[PDB]
Amino acid sequence: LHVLSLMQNAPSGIMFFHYSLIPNNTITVKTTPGLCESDELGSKCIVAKDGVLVSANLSYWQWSPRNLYKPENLTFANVIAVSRGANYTTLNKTFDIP
Amino acid sequence: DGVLVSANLSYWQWSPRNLYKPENLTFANVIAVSRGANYTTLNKTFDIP
Numbered sequence: 001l002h003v004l005s006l007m008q009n010a011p012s013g014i015m016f017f018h019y020s021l022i023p024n025n026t027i028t029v030k031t032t033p034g035l036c037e038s039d040e041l042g043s044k045c046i047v048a049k050d051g052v053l054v055s056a057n058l059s060y061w062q063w064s065p066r067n068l069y070k071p072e073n074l075t076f077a078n079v080i081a082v083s084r085g086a087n088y089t090t091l092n093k094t095f096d097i098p
Numbered sequence: 099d100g101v102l103v104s105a106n107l108s109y110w111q112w113s114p115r116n117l118y119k120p121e122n123l124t125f126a127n128v129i130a131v132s133r134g135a136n137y138t139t140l141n142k143t144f145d146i147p
């Protein structure tokens with residue numbers, strides 16, 4: 001993951017300072033594309049806004065960015081409501097978000 | 099996640115971006131948005147809730 005890259009001069013050349021983000025501590029979680037409450041085609045279903053839906057082997061689903069795990073309770077802000085496009089995961093309970 | 103398509107046919111269908119497997123458009127494969135560019139008026143109401 002690329003952050004910033006400066007360049008400096010050098011003898012007979014040029015040398016780049018590529019700053020990056022190698023990750024080191026993985027944590028294994030569960031990840032859906034999105035959550036449904038109803039089995040019916042045409043149900044109210046949701047997907048994450050600029051992130052991935054995540055559960056750390058936990059009873060309910062959460063929000064986390066695409067490349068790093070800072071889990072958050074999913075709200076209206078970080079959730080896009082769309083469709084039954086792929087097979088999203090039915091969690092068999094109604095929403096906690098207006 | 100696809101393109102709207104008609105094989106010189108009376109009504110429009112859904113197909114992926116790079117391959118032609120036409121499907122009747124449903125609620126699943128259709129996003130409702132706006133009158134942004136000049137989309138095509140088909141002069142009939144929808145068949146999808």
Ligand SMILES: *[C@@H]1O[C@H](CO)[C@@H](O)[C@H](O)[C@H]1NC(C)=O
Pocket residue numbers: 027028029056057
């Ligand atoms: C989640 O469950 C998997 C099952 O294989 C386990 O290996 C892993 O340690 C668990 N991770 C967390 C964060 O609970």
Ligand SMILES: *[C@@H]1O[C@H](CO)[C@@H](O)[C@H](O)[C@H]1NC(C)=O
Pocket residue numbers: 060073
């Ligand atoms: C997230 O929601 C759970 C209940 O669903 C609550 O117990 C917890 O305090 C909330 N906040 C976190 C994990 O920061």
Ligand SMILES: *[C@@H]1O[C@H](CO)[C@@H](O)[C@H](O)[C@H]1NC(C)=O
Pocket residue numbers: 039090091092
């Ligand atoms: C609850 O979830 C199970 C599997 O996750 C599946 O049978 C269906 O989505 C739901 N079942 C019922 C009876 O609502």
Ligand SMILES: *[C@@H]1O[C@H](CO)[C@@H](O)[C@H](O)[C@H]1NC(C)=O
Pocket residue numbers: 105106
């Ligand atoms: C569609 O119409 C065009 C008109 O030029 C024709 O050339 C083409 O063969 C037709 N294709 C199909 C699949 O009907």
Ligand SMILES: *[C@@H]1O[C@H](CO)[C@@H](O)[C@H](O)[C@H]1NC(C)=O
Pocket residue numbers: 109122
């Ligand atoms: C798609 O809809 C048409 C009518 O609009 C129907 O005749 C046809 O059987 C449907 N299914 C297909 C093409 O698989």
Ligand SMILES: *[C@@H]1O[C@H](CO)[C@@H](O)[C@H](O)[C@H]1NC(C)=O
Pocket residue numbers: 139140141
């Ligand atoms: C029906 O479509 C035609 C051309 O596609 C255009 O005049 C307009 O979009 C519609 N006309 C009427 C009278 O609704």
